[PDB]
């Protein structure tokens, strides 16, 4: 059983070391908090939160870093190496990369203005990476609501609240033009923009992402507060201003009878959202963890111990 007090005796300063690292990095890279939270999400959706995503290539297994959802998208790996080294110095061979990344995600959310809580701990590190599983398990922005629900249920999150609350991670961070080009110019081969995208916002996005333009150009997920972790993401959805298809479907999909009330509830109360986010975050963080003597306490998050 994972417990928030796991390192209270072996490494009481772990959370503070993680926080300090993120604070330092945020000065030069204001996007790092968002990037780290996403790394934890992509770690947990593939064989559970086991730091499998942090492993680099080997001749026996490919890295998840080359999965369609991670390649030229996932970032922050060097920062994780930095805090790991700092933690290893303070507490040699004690904190797993899986736990480190979980704490980092929580601290990132808090530093961005979100809720503060102690995450359950005790996870251990994987002995391999899972590229095929990552390609199969990570959701895509073009997924329909039924597909998004399927993706979450596939890893163990059955509740619509899990999906709606965790999608709140898009209250900050960046998204490449490539992922919304269809919504802007030719949605579902209709030759027209996605009708669920506010027409005024449509114009703005088309200006940032012109046809035949730089597909790697970055756009803010939350037009209200781009770098602050708050409930503004849901207010945008109510106005048809969700950035990607998967965001807006939570409010506009024909299958959204169960998600609409959640979207409204989170848009109406920061407290309601923050509570739901913590609850869902801990549930995602409890996905098939390695515990006890299973797996290892990886020393270098990029390679399995030898």
94 in a known ligand binding site = no
Q: Based on the residue annotation, tell me whether 42 is a catalytic residue of this protein.
A: yes
Query: What DSSP letter does each residue of 272-301 carry, written as one string?
Result: HHHHHHHHHHHHHTTSS-B-TTSSB--SBT
25 in a known ligand binding site = no
Judged by beta carbon distances under 5 to 8 A according to partner kind, the member of ligand HEM, Ca ion, none in contact with residue 232 is Ca ion
Catalytic residue among 38, 40, 42, 65: 42
Our finding on whether 228 is near Ca ion (CB under 5 A) is: yes
**According to CB under 5 A, which residues from 34 to 93 bind Ca ion?**
43, 46-47, 50, 52
Smaller CB separation from ligand HEM, 122 or 139: 139
Judged by beta carbon distances under 5 to 8 A according to partner kind, the member of Ca ion, ligand HEM, none in contact with residue 185 is none
Q: Which residue has the tokens 């993401």?
A: 233
**Interface residue with Ca ion, options 222, 241, 285, 289 (CB under 5 A):** 222
Distance in Å, CB of 192 to Ca ion, minimum: 29
191, burial (CB in 10 Å: exposed 0-12, middle 13-18, buried 19+): exposed
> d(Cα 126, Cα 50) in Å, to the nearest integer?
5
CB atoms within 10 A of CB 201: 16
Residue nearest to ligand HEM (CB): 173
User: Per this entry, what is the length of the chain?
Assistant: 306
Our finding on whether 170 is near Ca ion (CB under 5 A) is: no
Binding site for ligand HEM (CB under 6 A): 31, 34-35, 37-38, 41, 73, 75, 139-141, 143, 148, 166-167, 169-170, 173-176, 179, 244, 246
Smaller CB separation from Ca ion, 52 or 193: 52
52 in a known ligand binding site = yes
Query: Can you state the percent helix, strand and coil of the chain, rounding each to 5?
Result: 50, 5, 45
The terminus-to-terminus CA distance of the chain in angstroms comes to: 27
222 in a known ligand binding site = yes
Distance in Å, CB of 9 to ligand HEM, minimum: 30
> d(Cα 183, Cα 219) in Å, to the nearest integer?
14
Candidates 90, 99, 116; CA nearest to 5 is 99
Candidates 265, 140, 139, 242; CA nearest to 194 is 242
How many whole angstroms from its chain centre is CA 186? 27
Binding residues for heme b: 170
Binding residues for Ca(2+): 43, 46, 48, 50, 52, 64, 171, 222, 225, 230
Sites of contact with Ca ion (CB under 5 A): 43, 46-47, 50, 52, 171, 222, 225, 228, 230, 232
């Amino acid at each position: 059983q994972l417990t928030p007090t796991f390192y209270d005796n072996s490494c009481p300063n772990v959370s503070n070391i993680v926080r300090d690292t993120i604070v330092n990095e945020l000065r030069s890279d204001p996007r790092i908090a968002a990037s780290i939270l996403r790394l934890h999400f992509h770690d947990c959706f593939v064989n559970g939160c086991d730091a499998s995503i942090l492993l680099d290539n080997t001749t026996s297994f490919r890295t998840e870093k080359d999965a369609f959802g991670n390649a030229n998208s996932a970032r922050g790996f060097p920062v994780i190496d930095r805090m790991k080294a700092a933690v290893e110095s303070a507490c040699p061979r004690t904190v797993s990369c899986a736990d480190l990344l979980t704490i980092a995600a929580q601290q990132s959310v808090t530093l961005a203005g979100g809720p503060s809580w102690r995450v359950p701990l005790g996870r251990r590190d994987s002995l391999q990476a899972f590229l095929d599983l990552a390609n199969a398990n990570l959701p895509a922005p073009f997924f329909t609501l039924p597909q998004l629900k399927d993706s979450f249920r596939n890893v163990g999150l059955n509740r619509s609240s899990d999906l709606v609350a965790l999608s709140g991670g898009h209250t900050f961070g960046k998204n490449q033009c490539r992922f919304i080009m269809d919504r802007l110019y030719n949605f579902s081969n209709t030759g027209l923009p996605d009708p669920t995208l506010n027409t005024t916002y449509l114009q703005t996005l088309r200006g940032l992402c012109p046809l035949n333009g730089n597909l790697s150009a970055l756009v803010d997920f939350d037009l209200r507060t781009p770098t602050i972790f708050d409930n503004k993401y849901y207010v945008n959805l109510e106005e048809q201003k969700g950035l990607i298809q998967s965001d807006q479907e939570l409010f506009s999909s024909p299958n959204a009878t169960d998600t609409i009330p959640l979207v409204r509830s989170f848009a109406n109360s920061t407290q309601t959202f923050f509570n739901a986010f913590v609850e869902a975050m801990d549930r995602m963080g409890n996905i098939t963890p390695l515990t006890g003597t299973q797996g290892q306490i990886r020393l270098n998050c990029r390679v399995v111990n030898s």
